[PDB]
Amino acid sequence: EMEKEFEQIDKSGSWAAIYQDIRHEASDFPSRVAKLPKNKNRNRYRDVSPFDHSRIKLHQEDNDYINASLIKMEEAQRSYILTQGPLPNTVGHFWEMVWEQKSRGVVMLNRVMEKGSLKCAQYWPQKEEKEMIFEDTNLKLTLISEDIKSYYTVRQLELENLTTQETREILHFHYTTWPDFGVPESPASFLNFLFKVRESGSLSPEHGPVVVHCSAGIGRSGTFCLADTCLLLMDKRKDPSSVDIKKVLLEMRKFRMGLIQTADQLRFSYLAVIEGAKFIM
Numbered sequence: 001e002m003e004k005e006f007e008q009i010d011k012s013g014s015w016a017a018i019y020q021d022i023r024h025e026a027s028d029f030p031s032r033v034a035k036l037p038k039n040k041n042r043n044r045y046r047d048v049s050p051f052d053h054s055r056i057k058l059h060q061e062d063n064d065y066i067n068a069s070l071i072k073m074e075e076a077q078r079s080y081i082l083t084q085g086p087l088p089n090t091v092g093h094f095w096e097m098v099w100e101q102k103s104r105g106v107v108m109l110n111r112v113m114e115k116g117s118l119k120c121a122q123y124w125p126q127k128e129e130k131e132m133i134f135e136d137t138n139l140k141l142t143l144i145s146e147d148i149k150s151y152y153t154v155r156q157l158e159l160e161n162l163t164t165q166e167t168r169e170i171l172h173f174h175y176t177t178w179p180d181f182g183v184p185e186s187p188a189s190f191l192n193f194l195f196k197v198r199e200s201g202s203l204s205p206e207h208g209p210v211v212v213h214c215s216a217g218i219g220r221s222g223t224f225c226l227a228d229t230c231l232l233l234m235d236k237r238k239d240p241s242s243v244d245i246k247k248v249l250l251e252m253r254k255f256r257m258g259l260i261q262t263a264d265q266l267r268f269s270y271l272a273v274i275e276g277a278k279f280i281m
């Protein structure tokens with residue numbers, strides 16, 4: 001059981017060691033499309049690339065590339081799109097992907113500015129009466145409502161395909177309190193946020209996969225998917241304690257490199273799953 005594994009690693013301070021074994025065992029697949037010179041300005045970080053086998057393709061004939069991966073967790077019946085925070089020049093591609101994949105929710109785990117630098121373009125409207133038009137992908141985005149809470153904001157957006165005049169409602173879940181350095185002290189507000197996303201129907205199989213992002217789409221975004229999938233497997237299995245976090249993480253790393261960036265994020269993922277298991281047993 002993970003609770004006892006947690007105390008062992010914590011009392012022995014072996015987190016950096018566990019983390020390094022995960023790094024060593026992780027899959028490595030080609031990412032040739034990401035490294036084409038015509039895609040250089042579609043990547044925020046030169047060392048963070050989607051694998052070719054799991055990359056999301058845009059339905060535009062010119063250039064189908066976006067820095068985004070489909071993570072398919074077969075046993076949990078959960079899919080996620082993990083992507084980078086959009087760049088000034090990829091905001092149109094971002095919303096095209098949302099439209100094409102039939103996503104109902106966007107989960108954002110970063111602030112636009114952190115540590116005095118821009119981590120993400122401002123890719124949604126700040127006011128009801130000032131809608132955004134993405135001329136390159138022919139989409140219009142309107143803010144419908146905004147509910148600001150202590151730890152997160154939920155926004156109701158209308159996305160309109162200007163080509164077909166179809167409209168969809170998208171929910172934007174913005175976790176606003178992840179600290180600039182390290183991880184939250186307690187996983188309580190992160191779990192509360194994860195339950196809120198679940199309650200919305202955004203993670204349900206009726207819809208396309210949820211879009212999850214931070215700045216690179218591997219660290220905080222990794223923690224989100226890892227916690228959700230681990231808690232769902234504990235509901236599904238005859239024996240909840242057969243769930244090995246390390247195995248689940250390695251299965252997720254087949255689909256996108258680098259998920260969980262630090263030993264601290266790994267420890268936080270254990271704590272989130274351990275605490276979430278109480279509200280589930």
Ligand SMILES: CCC(=O)Nc1nc(C)cs1
Nearest residue numbers: 145146147154155156200
């Ligand atoms: C007021 C904004 C808001 O909370 N919209 C939501 N709709 C659902 C279904 C969950 S949250």
